[PDB]
Design a protein around this ligand. Structure first.
Ligand SMILES: O=c1cc(-c2ccc(O)c(O)c2)oc2ccccc12
Ligand SMILES: [Zn+2]
Lengths: 47, 161
């Protein structure tokens, strides 16, 4: 696993083309996230 | 140390998590190649993940970050999709869950869009789809995502497409 940029704790991937996309984020230490919900689902076939 | 508690569909928490799931579906630029073609989900079950040790590991790091950043953790609720969600809920995130080839370097990736994490459920790029039918767009087989609490601290802003 790499290091975060000197002076920073994470990276924010800001979308700069797809206007409908929300952000993505990267952490470099596994201790910076906690799994709160497990969601079981099917994708639904559009009608 | 992990237990899973089923939420009732009548519970406001089931309803707010279902809503974040359903409301952050977007179309993807791969036309559904990686994750399938759908506009909404059939939510079959929502379970709360409880593990004391993993929680304390999270809050410890959260405080260190906060104190390096004028008392601001910059905490978010974000999706994560993977074939290893059953390992993550038991052992936590670590370098085995890192996307070595990701755009922002070797780290662990999270999404605001549920449908972005859905693309990683059967592997990078959707792998070979469901185990039973080998279908990345399977409408029969049951899938699983994590909705996670994440500490960003001082985040390096990378503009990108
Ligand atoms: O949910 C994600 C999981 C993963 C992911 C990637 C590679 C892996 O080996 C993995 O276990 C998860 O990548 C993402 C990239 C952007 C936004 C969200 C994700
Ligand atoms: Zn299937």
């Amino acid at each position: 696993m790499a290091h975060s940029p000197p002076g920073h704790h994470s990276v924010t991937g800001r979308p700069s083309v797809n206007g409908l996309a929300l952000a993505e984020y990267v952490i470099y230490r596994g201790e910076q996230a906690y799994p709160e919900y497990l969601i079981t689902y099917q994708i639904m076939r559009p009608e | 140390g992990t237990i899973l508690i089923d939420l009732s569909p009548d519970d406001k928490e089931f309803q707010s998590v279902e809503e974040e799931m359903q409301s952050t579906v977007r179309e993807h630029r791969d036309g559904g190649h990686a994750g399938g073609i759908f506009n909404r989900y059939n939510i079959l079950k929502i379970q709360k993940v409880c593990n004391k040790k993993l929680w304390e590991r999270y809050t410890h790091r959260r405080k260190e970050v906060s104190e390096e950043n004028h008392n601001h953790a910059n905490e978010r609720m974000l999706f994560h999709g993977s074939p290893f969600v059953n390992a993550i809920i038991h052992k936590g995130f670590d370098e085995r869950h890192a996307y070595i080839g990701g755009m922002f370097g070797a780290g662990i990736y999270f999404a605001e869009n549920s449908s972005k994490s859905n693309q990683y459920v059967y592997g990078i790029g959707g792998g070979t789809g469901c185990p039973v039918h080998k279908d990345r767009s399977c409408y029969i087989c049951h899938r699983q995502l994590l909705f996670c609490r994440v500490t960003l601290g001082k985040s390096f802003l990378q503009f990108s497409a």
